[PDB]
Symmetry: C3
Subunit: 328 residues, 3 copies
Amino acid sequence: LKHFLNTQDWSRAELDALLTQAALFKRNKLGSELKGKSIALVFFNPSMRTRTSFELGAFQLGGHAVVLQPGPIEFNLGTVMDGDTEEHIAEVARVLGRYVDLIGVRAFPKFVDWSKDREDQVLKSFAKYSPVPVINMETITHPCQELAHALALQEHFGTPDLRGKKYVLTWTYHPKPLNTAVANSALTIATRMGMDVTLLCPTPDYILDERYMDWAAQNVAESGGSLQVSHDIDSAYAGADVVYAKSWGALPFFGNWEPEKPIRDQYQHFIVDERKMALTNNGVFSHCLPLRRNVKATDAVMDSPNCIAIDEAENRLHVQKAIMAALV
Amino acid sequence: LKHFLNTQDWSRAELDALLTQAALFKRNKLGSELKGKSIALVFFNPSMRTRTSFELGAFQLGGHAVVLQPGPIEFNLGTVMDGDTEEHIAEVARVLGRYVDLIGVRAFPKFVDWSKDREDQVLKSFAKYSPVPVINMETITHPCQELAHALALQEHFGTPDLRGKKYVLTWTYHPKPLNTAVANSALTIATRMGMDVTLLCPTPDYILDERYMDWAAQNVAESGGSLQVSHDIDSAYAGADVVYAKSWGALPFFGNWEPEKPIRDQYQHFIVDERKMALTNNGVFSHCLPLRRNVKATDAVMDSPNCIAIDEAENRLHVQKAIMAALV
Amino acid sequence: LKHFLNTQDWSRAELDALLTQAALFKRNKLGSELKGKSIALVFFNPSMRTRTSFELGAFQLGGHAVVLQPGPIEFNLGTVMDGDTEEHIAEVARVLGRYVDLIGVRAFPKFVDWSKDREDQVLKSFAKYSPVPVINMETITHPCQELAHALALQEHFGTPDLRGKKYVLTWTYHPKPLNTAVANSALTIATRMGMDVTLLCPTPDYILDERYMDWAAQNVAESGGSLQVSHDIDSAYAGADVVYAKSWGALPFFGNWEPEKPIRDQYQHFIVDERKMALTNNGVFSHCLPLRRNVKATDAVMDSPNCIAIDEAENRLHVQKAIMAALV
């Protein structure tokens, strides 16, 4: 009945409890909250980091993770399956639900159409047909990353209350168009936590889907923080406490990534470097990984003592354990 | 020494004991029958369902399953390995046998020749060279499915004795020629259990290999049931207690599936629907999965309360645990 | 801090202790030396045998192995990652190091250049950036195989002291050029153990890289054994106690394997057979596997009671457990 599809679906108190359980697990990693239980990790797209953290997380709590990497499933109802689909998600979710206690789902968008991708069909289908809790391991939003990220910020600042912090979610250069998942999640969680958020991107075409812009706005009101869109690098970084980098192809160009290649390439200066970081208030830098060094961020920034990307990546483990424990 | 290659190899009392242990495991899933033991699940062909049930089954009994998906093995003796084969099954089975306590084998036929496929070389080779019990996870017969299927029928009818039940194994439409494995197993187990069996198919060309027809006949005599081949849909369904659907390419066409495409396509009416099911004696419907909705069976039949396909799929878990426990 | 990259890095006393712990584990396989611990098995190249032994080894000691098969990683520093690499080994090793207690690495050479391959970049990179012990699961040397091999010899001869034994590392025919890893390791460990070693190959072009020739020489001096290069089959086998076969492409031909195909094909007589084995002092035969029957060794030699290849393969399990236990 209760799933962990997006943090936006959980009340603030529930998210706070998850973060605290995550901190507790970080102090005592071995437990029995999942003793004799199991989780099916269904990866429609490969991920070494996510597979490792979840698999180990289940093991450490006495459970077992079954890793499934399909590779042809039909999600549409009343559809004559005479095509290339062998079985309907109805049967898949229901069968797995007779075996495991939880189901994790990872499904990256096709990038051939944001119009379709934004529907989150794969995840919504599992959540609808599954008799057991479903966990978003990343589709168009990365909720587990949000919490790992948030925990890392709380540990860094020495407090659970992040209000008053200047948070800068900056777009970054990449030779190819990327998913907005991490970006959408970053906006969601930074505002939900009540920080002064600024979405820094090259042009208005890079502004995130309305769904998330509304989420952020709605969260600003609840948390007492602030939101703001910007296109000026130097002013955005100024006096910033946190800088989060993430690359993503402008939504208005989904389907054809040819005329955009020259557009993104003229913005290879949005790379986070010491010059920019020095403008902040001794702010910290982080990225969700994988990160292309000297493209999204310079080797100097990465190896800096202000980069907490490795801590954030570690926290995926502790945060995902808190989620699995809450759902069982 | 003792393997679980086919149910036909086990006495009726042993099969009854397996089914009962399976029911016991269904009531108490956690156990120690495999404590510290392991099973190697060798999949020459991918299977999410079979991998999940076996892996979880080993975990629940205190054991560990190692999943191996090759992808070049030689099974022929005295064959100069100067071809594309790197190692002989002799070495593979013997080495794995020094590591694990049980070996599961899944190997779908090549469909390029039923003449060769019917030899069950992969399975027979493992059973011959392996120092530990071998388990058929599906090749040309699906013995684990047979028991999962049989258990589901016993639970549905509220009794272990299925004698007197009208069982209809019906062929079903599919855009492509399929393996007869599930069909051969269905005939084997339905007759072994003593039911009034009817093999419903379009033309005599779809009759199953003699090996299984003889098995069925031999089982009818032992169980006190009956066997019968039919080509009339309405008469077959009439007063039926159980309807099992399965698609499969006529054996006489193995090698060339071109002139058969038009032959099978003219029989897309063999699809199980409410019209047919209504003719039975409030009979139950089931399929081994994966099932193409609105092709092999209509969405109406699938979502009906008489469809026990999800229960049968669940039982793969309990039945496979009974098998692993009996073999160690 | 301490890794298991090559046996040559460990003192003789440490190697002796590993071999003894391995013998102890062979007598009592279940233990708690890895209770609650985990190892990441990173396979850049597939290996059923190595995956099975390590995974089971972790399970038997109360731990858990996470299997990762990438398939695009950058190992070069200060390299603008605008190519086909998504993330730097720096981030990979560091993140995995926050999750698991040990990291195993398997990476076969590209064969496109021994000049580059001999650098052991993949392994050295992991060992440099990883915060936890790294284990060579085979790159250009196969140290786990060395110990499995050595243990099998000690069990066969009924003593830990192998000094005085005539060891013949023979090159063998193969339709394609192979890695020297196993060959380099065989020379290393046979000399380190103090045996009378003879490297039997067709022509001086097949002599192993200087690195290992020096290693052997340096080991002969320490162990009191002997080294010797030979090109005469009959004289090499004569009075031999141990015969180890392994195929490998001459190092001087790395990059272009066309003019070598005809060169290796004229030496298909280097195959180990009863005629040759009969010349030894009732010597034992072994191979690391996979082995092409009737090409590297005849079916007669393989099925002989003097072939200890299956025992050596089994010992990978016990030896790898000793290594994992020593590193944690």
